[PDB]
Amino acid sequence: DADLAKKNNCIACHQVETKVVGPALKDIAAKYADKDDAATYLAGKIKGGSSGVWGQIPMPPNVNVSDADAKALADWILTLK
Ligand code: HEC
């Protein structure tokens, strides 16, 4: 899989097992979006950006993509296992 997050930017710094700027996807998803529907929870951090939640560089305010194309991603993020 992997295509929308790459077509936009999510993957630009979020791989599946490895990471470049921030944390990888297999983790960001298994880190907080691995319990309940955190997808709706952490949805506040994705756009809220991060500063000292991980340790990497501070990510800018990027939610997912645009209107719906953005949500279509949050789905593939909860199914990266
Ligand atoms: C490089 C320019 C990035 C792109 C493109 C995207 N993200 Fe990112 N993200 C990046 C970094 C360096 C970090 C770590 C910040 C830190 O605290 O050290 C992150 C982190 C996240 C997180 C974690 C939020 C948290 O739990 O505090 C999420 C949920 C996240 N990023 C989501 C996300 C999405 C959905 C992106 C595509 C729209 C995306 N990121 C792109 C760097 C980069």
Swiss-Prot record:
Q: What is its main location?
A: periplasm
- Subcellular compartments: Periplasm
Quote a single Gene Ontology cellular component term. periplasmic space
Task: Provide the binding site for heme c.
Answer: 10, 13-14, 59
Keywords attached to this entry: Electron transport, Heme, Iron, Metal-binding, Periplasm, Signal, Transport
Q: How is it modified after translation?
A: Binds 1 heme c group covalently per subunit.
Q: Molecular function (GO) terms listed?
A: electron transfer activity; heme binding; iron ion binding
- Quaternary structure annotation from Swiss-Prot or TrEMBL: Monomer.
Please describe what this protein does. Monoheme c-type cytochrome. Probable electron donor to membrane cytochrome oxidase and to periplasmic nitrite reductase.
State the name under which the record lists this protein: Cytochrome c-552
Provide the species name.
Answer: Nitrosomonas europaea (strain ATCC 19718 / CIP 103999 / KCTC 2705 / NBRC 14298)
Q: Identify the taxonomic lineage of the organism of origin.
A: Bacteria, Pseudomonadati, Pseudomonadota, Betaproteobacteria, Nitrosomonadales
Tell me the part of the parent protein that is shown: 23 to 103 of 103
